[PDB]
Design a protein around this ligand. Structure first.
Ligand SMILES: [Zn+2]
Lengths: 213, 99, 139, 74, 127, 59
RNA sequence: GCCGGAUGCGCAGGGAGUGGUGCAUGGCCGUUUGCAACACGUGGGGUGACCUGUCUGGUUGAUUCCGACAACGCGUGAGGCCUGGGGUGCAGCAGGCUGUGCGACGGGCGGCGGCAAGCUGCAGGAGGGCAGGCGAAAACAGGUCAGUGAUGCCCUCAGAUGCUCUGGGCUGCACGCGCACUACAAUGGCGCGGCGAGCGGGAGUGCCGGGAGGCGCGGGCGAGGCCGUGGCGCAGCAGGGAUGGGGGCCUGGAAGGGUGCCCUGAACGAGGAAUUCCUAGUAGCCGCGGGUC
């Protein structure tokens, strides 16, 4: 029994997932792309792709969604047998950081000033229930010198196991007349026992005390 | 003679799988063996952090570990198929040996 | 074989090697007086009867591997007879023993009937069990 | 350049279904249309230059799509 | 009939011991008797335990100790812990218990690592 | 009566068969620092960006 | 050699470039950090920049806390945390494996300090600063355009700064320097016998050969050393193994590569001014395995 063999096949399922998520972002660059999740160990591989719009991405009534599914049957021999992709829209568009990341990318394409762009998102994050949001805009914003302007508010943790639960961060790159601008959006999630809004387990430092009466 | 072999990287998922399968197996048979956990086959990759040679010897170690569970019994092939239909809502990799 | 260990180990060896020389059941090669015994060694063995003394050491290793209920070959056995090679300015790396004389010294242990093969592994036989039994009775 | 035999062989192929080509030019015999690879990429490079098909690149592989708007033209 | 198993260990050297009500006292560590051990420090580190406890407690107890792993010197302290641990575990199972408390207090005052494990493991630094 | 080596005017039949340059990163076209370990075949610099996406934990 | 000089009617323009610019950039990484700092809401002081909050003192690895306080409440970082390590409760299964918990908090005690925070000794205990991980704000003209189907701009594009092939170089050598290796030996070296690890768990076997190596089957591994003992015996000596000669092989298309055999047997007899690293299973010694291949 080989330990080398078992690890190699699992990351083989992993290395296609890294390619596929890299593929979908370039594929749905006109839309908002919010990530994907994969269930590959079954005989039908089920791909859930998260895009802000549902009716546009499926495309000419299931045409282009099967057209992009057709070439994915060709590329990956690992489970070439059965693949099914089905799109979903994010429940809160503010809480996904890529949704806000590609938003200001579209604003910078339209030559909107980034300061007007950045307060538009961090207001929309706060009104959507999220706990804290930092927006980092790096690039040649004014002039040839490049600055890394960093707007922030609210509770955003940086260390702990709660970091991988509670902050979800994004990176989108912008190509303009002047050069390359990178916009990092890192958003803290509100705690909710049902995981549709945030993590189920609380941050470890927070405690609850019952009441004596 | 059935060998139900299942492998998974997430442990809180593969323990929910073996729990509901053992809830399914005791409905079937009482001579069903307990869930046996083989050696967690683990692997590490050590990598330089810098995409250049400006820094100190800063090495980031990434790890993968897959957890294995097994079941052994001697059943009917129709029971093997309804076992097989049970473990497809699970993301754990499933493979079976009938010898 | 518990009574194998109840005598001294090196005192068993010349009692075993002197048995293999007196009974003439291990035969010397042509170049026996000049064998490096490893490519890590710097000299040939200084002992004139080194060949028998190794034949006692190899037959003892097959004896204990039977006591551990384990099978041993010639290539794995050469690793027990390897030294660390003075590699010059490089660090002294461990190297394997010389396989060539170990293979012939076991084939003579097949001719005496001490060692009978089991599958692709040679094993100690009952004849090797008995003839050790008179030896360790005397030590 | 290249013979019109394998030009229209993949051009008739594209009208039913979309093909993807690796940039591995020393690899020959494309997995679908067993033709040398540096042939088949150059004409689809002509197709994007004539603005017919759309090209998406990800990890050494070019995913070429012919959108439905240009399909009825061809 | 009467048989107990206790384990002691140094750094990565683990040692089992089996204590039985044999005919005469004997310690056959790693299938080798105590008088014929090639390493005398292996033999003396067993013998001072017999010197501390006194030979009257080892009246009929046969110790078949096996050891594996570790180097030479950590094998000495592996069996030395395992020899004493199996000695007190025999009295706790098959003999009177207040003598076992008498023996345990004798050994713990003698040296702590005879009966408890040395937690000191090979703790390597990084680069 | 010597064997004449099959291939080019020079000896080798097919280049890119041996050594660094036959292999590349499966993401960024480079011959520099490929992790062939566990059959990954992506480079050192790409493996940071895709590590936890494979299922690797830092820990 | 070859044209990935597409495409719009020789030109236009795209595309390509390990060409240039990291002082045009993204990302990432380094360094400040092996740090303990940073900030808001409101209020107060000042015309104001600012200050207080964020502190006399005490304390802590920590702006950690006690406390006095024109501040009061918060937030990041610190902590909490996550992983491995030791102890054992239960459960399951078969160089034993992996789930689930428990166990340590500085709790107890003594003495200092007393709204104290805490410090310190001992007992108990497997354990009383274990090893890692994530790691704030701000910077730096830090490094990377040679990781990139990340890229602006400039230059090049047919006698090309494109690709590819072959050969050579990156391995040149009066010399300066960094980091390591092996040593200068007797606490040693050499020759046999004996006993022999962990990470990593795929590999042994039979035959040929003096070795390297070869061949044929093929579910399948273990070190320096230490102990015992024989020789040498203070010697540029059986220390040292540099350099070189002749032969045998391996890999590859191709040896300057590796390995093996024999022989030659250099400096080096403890290393100037200087200077690095390190507090316990640690330094050091000693091998082994993995990445590269
Ligand atoms: Zn790469």
């Amino acid at each position: 029994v080989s330990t080398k063999q078992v690890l190699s096949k699992f990351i083989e399922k992993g290395i296609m997932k890294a390619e596929l998520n890299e593929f979908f972002s370039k594929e749905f660059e006109d839309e908002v792309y919010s990530g994907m999740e994969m269930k590959p160990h079954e005989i039908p591989v089920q791909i859930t792709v998260r895009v802000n719009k549902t009716h546009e991405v499926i495309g000419e009534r299931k045409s282009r969604l099967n057209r992009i599914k057709h070439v994915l049957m060709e590329r990956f021999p690992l489970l070439r047998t059965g693949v099914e992709i089905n799109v979903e829209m994010v429940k809160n568009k503010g809480l996904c950081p890529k949704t806000q990341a590609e938003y200001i990318k579209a604003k910078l394409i339209e030559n909107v000033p980034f300061r007007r762009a950045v307060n538009s998102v961090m207001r929309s994050i706060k009104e959507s229930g999220a706990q804290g949001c930092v927006i980092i805009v790096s690039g040649k914003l004014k002039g040839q010198r490049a600055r890394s302007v960093k707007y922030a508010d609210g509770l955003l943790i940086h260390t702990g196991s709660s970091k991988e639960d509670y902050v979800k961060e994004a990176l989108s790159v912008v190509h303009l007349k002047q050069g390359v601008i990178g916009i990092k959006v890192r958003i803290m999630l509100p705690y909710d026992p049902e995981n549709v809004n945030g993590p189920s387990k609380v941050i470890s430092d927070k405690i609850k005390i019952f009441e004596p009466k | 003679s059935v060998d139900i072999n299942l492998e998974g990287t997430s442990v809180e998922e593969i323990e929910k799988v073996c729990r509901d399968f053992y809830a399914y197996a005791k409905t079937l048979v009482p001579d069903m063996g307990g869930v046996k956990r083989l050696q967690t086959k683990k692997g590490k990759i050590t990598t330089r952090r810098s995409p250049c040679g400006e820094g100190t010897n800063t090495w980031s170690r990434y790890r993968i570990s897959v957890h294995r569970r097994s079941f052994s019994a001697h059943l009917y092939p129709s029971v093997l198929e309804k076992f097989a239909t049970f473990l497809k809502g699970s993301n754990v990799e499933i493979s079976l040996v009938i010898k | 074989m518990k009574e194998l260990f109840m005598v001294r180990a090196d005192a068993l060896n010349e009692a075993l090697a002197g048995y293999l020389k007196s009974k003439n059941i291990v035969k010397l090669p042509e170049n026996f007086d000049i064998i490096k015994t490893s490519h890590g060694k710097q000299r040939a063995p200084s002992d004139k009867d080194w060949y028998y003394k190794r034949a006692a050491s190899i037959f003892r290793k097959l004896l204990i591997a039977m006591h551990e209920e384990k099978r041993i070959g010639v290539k794995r056995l050469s690793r027990k007879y390897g030294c660390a090679k003075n590699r010059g300015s490089r660090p002294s790396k461990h190297v394997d023993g010389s396989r060539g004389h170990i293979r012939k010294i076991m084939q003579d242990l097949e001719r005496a009937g001490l060692i009978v093969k089991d599958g692709n592994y040679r094993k100690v036989s009952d004849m090797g069990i008995i003839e050790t039994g008179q030896l360790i009775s005397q030590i | 350049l290249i013979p019109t035999k394998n030009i229209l062989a993949v051009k008739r192929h594209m009208l039913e279904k979309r093909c993807i080509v690796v940039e591995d030019t020393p690899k020959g015999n494309h997995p679908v249309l067993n033709i040398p690879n540096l042939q088949v990429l150059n004409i689809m490079k002509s197709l994007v230059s004539k603005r017919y098909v759309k090209k998406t690149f990800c990890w050494r592989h070019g995913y070429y799509f012919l959108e439905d708007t240009a399909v009825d033209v061809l | 009939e009467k048989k107990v198993i206790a384990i002691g260990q140094k750094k990565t050297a683990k040692a089992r011991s089996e204590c039985m009500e044999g005919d005469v006292f004997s310690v056959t560590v790693n299938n080798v008797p105590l008088r014929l051990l090639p390493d005398d420090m292996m033999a003396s580190k067993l013998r001072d335990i017999i010197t501390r406890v006194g030979l009257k407690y080892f009246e009929n107890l046969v110790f078949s100790i096996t050891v594996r792993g570790g180097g030479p010197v950590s094998k000495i302290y592996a069996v030395r812990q395992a020899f004493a641990k199996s000695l007190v575990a025999y009295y706790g199972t098959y003999m009177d218990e207040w003598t076992r408390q008498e023996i345990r207090s004798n050994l713990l005052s003698f040296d702590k690592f005879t009966l408890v494990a040395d937690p000191r493991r090979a703790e390597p630094k990084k680069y | 009566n010597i064997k004449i080596k099959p291939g080019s005017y020079a000896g080798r039949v097919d280049t890119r068969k041996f050594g660094r340059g036959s292999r590349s990163c499966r993401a960024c076209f480079t011959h520099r620092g490929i992790i062939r370990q566990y059959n990954l075949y992506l480079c050192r610099r790409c493996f940071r960006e895709y590590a936890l996406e494979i299922g690797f934990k830092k820990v």
